Design a protein around this ligand. Sequence first.
Ligand SMILES: C=C/C=C\[C@H](C)[C@H](OC(N)=O)[C@@H](C)[C@H](O)[C@@H](C)C/C(C)=C\[C@H](C)[C@@H](O)[C@@H](C)/C=C\[C@@H](O)C[C@@H]1OC(=O)[C@H](C)[C@@H](O)[C@H]1C
Ligand SMILES: Nc1nc2c(ncn2[C@@H]2O[C@H](COP(=O)(O)OP(=O)(O)OP(=O)(O)O)[C@@H](O)[C@H]2O)c(=O)[nH]1
Ligand SMILES: Nc1nc2c(ncn2[C@@H]2O[C@H](COP(=O)(O)OP(=O)(O)O)[C@@H](O)[C@H]2O)c(=O)[nH]1
Ligand SMILES: [Ca+2]
Ligand SMILES: [Mg+2]
Ligand SMILES: [Mg+2]
Lengths: 69, 426, 440
Amino acid sequence: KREHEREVIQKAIEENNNFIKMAKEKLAQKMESNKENREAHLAAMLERLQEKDKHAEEVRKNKELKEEA
Amino acid sequence: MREIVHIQAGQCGNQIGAKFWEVISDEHGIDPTGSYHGDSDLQLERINVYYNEATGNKYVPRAILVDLEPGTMDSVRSGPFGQIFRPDNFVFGQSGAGNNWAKGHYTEGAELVDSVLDVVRKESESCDCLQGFQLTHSLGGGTGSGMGTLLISKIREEYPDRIMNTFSVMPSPKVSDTVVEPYNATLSVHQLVENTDETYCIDNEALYDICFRTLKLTTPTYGDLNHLVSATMSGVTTCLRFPGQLNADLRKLAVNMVPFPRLHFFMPGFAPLTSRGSLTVPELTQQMFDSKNMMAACDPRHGRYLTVAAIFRGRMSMKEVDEQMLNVQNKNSSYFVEWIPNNVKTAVCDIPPRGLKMSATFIGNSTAIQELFKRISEQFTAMFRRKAFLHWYTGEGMDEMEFTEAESNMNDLVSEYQQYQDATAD
Amino acid sequence: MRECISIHVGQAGVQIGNACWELYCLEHGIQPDGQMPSDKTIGGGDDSFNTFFSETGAGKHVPRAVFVDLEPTVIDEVRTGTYRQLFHPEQLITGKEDAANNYARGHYTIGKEIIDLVLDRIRKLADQCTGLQGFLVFHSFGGGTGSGFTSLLMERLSVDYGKKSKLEFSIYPAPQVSTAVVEPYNSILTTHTTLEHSDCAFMVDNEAIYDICRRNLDIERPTYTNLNRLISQIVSSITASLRFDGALNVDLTEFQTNLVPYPRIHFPLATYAPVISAEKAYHEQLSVAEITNACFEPANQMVKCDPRHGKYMACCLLYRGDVVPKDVNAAIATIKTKRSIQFVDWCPTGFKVGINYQPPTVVPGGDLAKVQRAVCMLSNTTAIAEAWARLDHKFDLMYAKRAFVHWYVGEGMEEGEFSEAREDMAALEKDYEEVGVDSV
Ligand SMILES: C=C/C=C\[C@H](C)[C@H](OC(N)=O)[C@@H](C)[C@H](O)[C@@H](C)C/C(C)=C\[C@H](C)[C@@H](O)[C@@H](C)/C=C\[C@@H](O)C[C@@H]1OC(=O)[C@H](C)[C@@H](O)[C@H]1C
Ligand SMILES: Nc1nc2c(ncn2[C@@H]2O[C@H](COP(=O)(O)OP(=O)(O)OP(=O)(O)O)[C@@H](O)[C@H]2O)c(=O)[nH]1
Ligand SMILES: Nc1nc2c(ncn2[C@@H]2O[C@H](COP(=O)(O)OP(=O)(O)O)[C@@H](O)[C@H]2O)c(=O)[nH]1
Ligand SMILES: [Ca+2]
Ligand SMILES: [Mg+2]
Ligand SMILES: [Mg+2]
């Protein structure tokens, strides 16, 4: 009976610790995935904007070459 | 605080921009010298959203004034509230844009944009917590349309996590006969669909019609049109400028008003619009939902509302406003999409516009806005199929491919509005 | 011993917090400066009110509470208002930029910047407790902070305090006072995320409270102030067992034993009476029988739903004021022979009763009549799932077209989180169906 009493309380401890561990790991995973997703979104936005700057240089250069006519 | 930075570019942009500051300065009790002389603490509680506080208890509009020509801004400086603006915040060139979007966007405008950004940076640096930006401009000219949309793209690059808001004046032959305006408008819309979070469509077509048809003005001046614009801009920014619960900042407004990123073009409205010598909550409400009161030349009963914000101003029964807003939704249920529940939000502000006991301002995200874009598109293609006046733009380095792309994008936007208009819950 | 820490989150949580703590002070005779003349033990004690108030050596009684909001203007009014001396400045925590009605910003983008500070402040409250019992968390479903930051906080509290009890008071959205079209998204997301981390949650349907104010107090267009004073009376009824002693007083945890038959089925329906104006209460004493009968009137529930169309798994009656068991027993007997009260077949049908003898209090300038006796019924009924059904349906309408979803994805979330949250809600609705079915 004493052996059983010990097993019940160690079981309670194990389940509580595993709940904490799971919760901690789940939160870390979510926050990392979120961070990565947001950063990728912003990066895509800035990449498109930089293409715009690229195109603008191209336009001014095209005007330059036609004024060399 | 949550600061907004205001930018106004080109003639139209600086005109309606100046009127905006005159109108809200009066509302907030700020005189032409930047001193406060109001009679209500409600006036100053959120003053910092739009004004910087300097030495001597002076309030200075967080406003930047841009043009590729000195003209309009010289007269701004000579306006009533001309001395209120920060002199270092005047940025201008000498060339002019000649009603050419390409000069504004790629050439002249690009030569000046960096000096503008220097001022934007200086205003933004001393912000406790910058919300974002609002731009006033026309789409029909060269500077506001071309350099305006260039500024948007450049600002976006440095402030990618801030809200970008525009008051964009759409061109109409009823007001301006400048032939290339549908070119400039279409090229501009092409930028706005990609790079702004929310755009108020101030349609010169609608402004003219209101003045001519309703107000019986045979010959509307820019003065008349701009009263409509300033009344509207005052109304749609009251939730930003005074204490309140609904849409109290730029991002909360966007999150309530924009269900899909590209569909961020709003139909503004105002009440009362009545001729001289010709006002219940029920009557205010019915009027603000009538097509005759819209600042965009679209009939909302030719489409459906995705989202709506209504702002009532003045002393009135909150119970009565709630009942009438419920009533209008009930009687007009067909014109609100069923798959966005509770898509109409209402605010009441105790402080009315100058000279009025009661007023209502309307912000609609309606699929009927496609009528505005179809009108621009019809005028665009009639010129573009003949390749009329293209050398103005290609001579600046552009090619026809960009015109085609801008046209397709705007035509895509129309298709998208029609898609959500046709969508059902089942 | 037995300390309870309150955490008020976002505008709704904070303003309801204002109303509750003002009411507690009036109930215990604590002045706005925190002094309490009747408390003869200076700087400490193990009195019942010490579960909610710590004490300084200078005789100040300080709420065991943290207020948190991602913008400053609501909490600034606490910092500068009537009960400002009540709170240590470190208990009132603010950022600069709110969550813009966006769960993703509350839980991630903006919330992550302040969560460690908030936990440090809570830990400072915990360290002063000799027998911390748990947390009481006040927040809206609909706001970006109330939804997103609360979820983040509950998750982090599970990690830092383990299975220490966490109870919620959650404000369920109503169209009459709602400020965002996306509140159904926010509600489903936070309900899914917090579900495994909460032991018990008292939902407060703003529409139910709005209706009660209009109907029972004759208020034309209820303000948050009107709503919050009523809500604080209900919250006070529920926490009174923790803050007062008495022979017939029954601890909230004891009611909880009966109220939660399975971990996920942890949403009691609160019903409160009497809600009556001073003008109507004058010369009209409402007896134990009358206020008890009123608990089985759906118009008086904190959540709109119809228990007459569901099954009961528990019924608890929390009385306060001039009430003795004899009268309670007679009132209950009458009710059992006249009311639509059907229990599931696996649950006992006895009503569990607690009586706190300290009479109800009201705030000056309030709408409620001062009464001699009041009662809060807490029932576990399948009918509460109606509230989830209504919310889940609004969610489905918008999500089918992915309306507004780009706002959440832009802040780093994935569509995967939406469907996962919605599936959890579907399972919950199904759980409530299943517990109501008869045993084979
Ligand atoms: C031509 C109509 C003039 C006045 C009307 C009777 C109405 O006035 C009142 N008190 O109800 C006004 C609001 C009209 O309904 C609007 C069409 C006026 C409008 C915005 C534009 C007209 C086109 C424009 O010609 C304008 C110069 C005419 C009159 C302005 O002095 C009216 C004032 O102007 C404002 O902008 C504020 C709202 C407020 O101060 C208002 C009293
Ligand atoms: N009963 C009650 N409900 C409120 C109160 N304030 C807001 N609400 C409700 O709460 C929801 C809005 O969430 P808020 O708490 O204002 O938002 P928040 O938590 O501050 O989140 P953000 O402002 O988005 O950062 C809506 O359903 C409102 O009707 C209040 O004082 N009392
Ligand atoms: N409503 C309004 N429209 C204007 C005003 N000034 C110019 N516009 C319109 O703006 C377009 C011309 O653009 P403009 O701003 O003058 O060119 P820019 O200076 O190169 O930006 C035309 O459609 C005009 O009708 C004004 O003060 N009010
Ligand atoms: Ca003591
Ligand atoms: Mg001009
Ligand atoms: Mg808030």
